[PDB]
């Protein structure tokens with residue numbers, strides 16, 4: 474038993490809610506919140522901008538030190554950093570950004586990072602301003618992640634479309 478509330482059960486291990494991941498994190502304080510990162514950990518907009526804003530830019534400061542030490546992530550890769558006031562840890566995961574022309578096949582690799590954590594609060598990778606088909610992203614999630622994932626989808630119309638079209 475865990476403390477996530479109001480989620481719809483899609484599969485054995487995947488749950489979904491129409492909610493802002495920031496507000497879900499502030500409520501649950503999960504062990505892991507997933508950020509929809511880019512390879513430079515530049516958290517300007519989308520989910521990343523929203524999470525970073527809710528940390529008062531502490532996420533960005535920490536990320537800048539990470540990049541200065543380690544260099545950029547790979548598309549499809551991840552790193553674990555602090556969750557600041559939102560969660561114990563933040564798993565920064567880089568899905569492919571179709572609006573940058575990146576290879577959507579890397580989306581499966583991106584979701585594989587979730588399997589290193591028993592439970593996660595996550596956004597829909599590569600959707601939104603990353604330009605991929607959100608129905609496809611949800612399909613890849615369900616077919617790749619084996620650990621327990623609570624998906625927060627902020628856009629109400631999208632949430633409704635995702636539930637109604639789920640196979």
Ligand SMILES: O=C1CCCN1Nc1ncncc1-c1ncccc1F
Nearest residue numbers: 493494519520600601625626627628
């Ligand atoms: O709705 C969707 C589908 C894909 C990404 N996305 N956005 C979010 N998803 C979960 N929580 C928060 C946001 C969010 N909220 C405010 C500003 C920006 C944001 F990205």
Ligand SMILES: [Br-]
Nearest residue numbers: 519520601602
């Ligand atoms: Br977005």
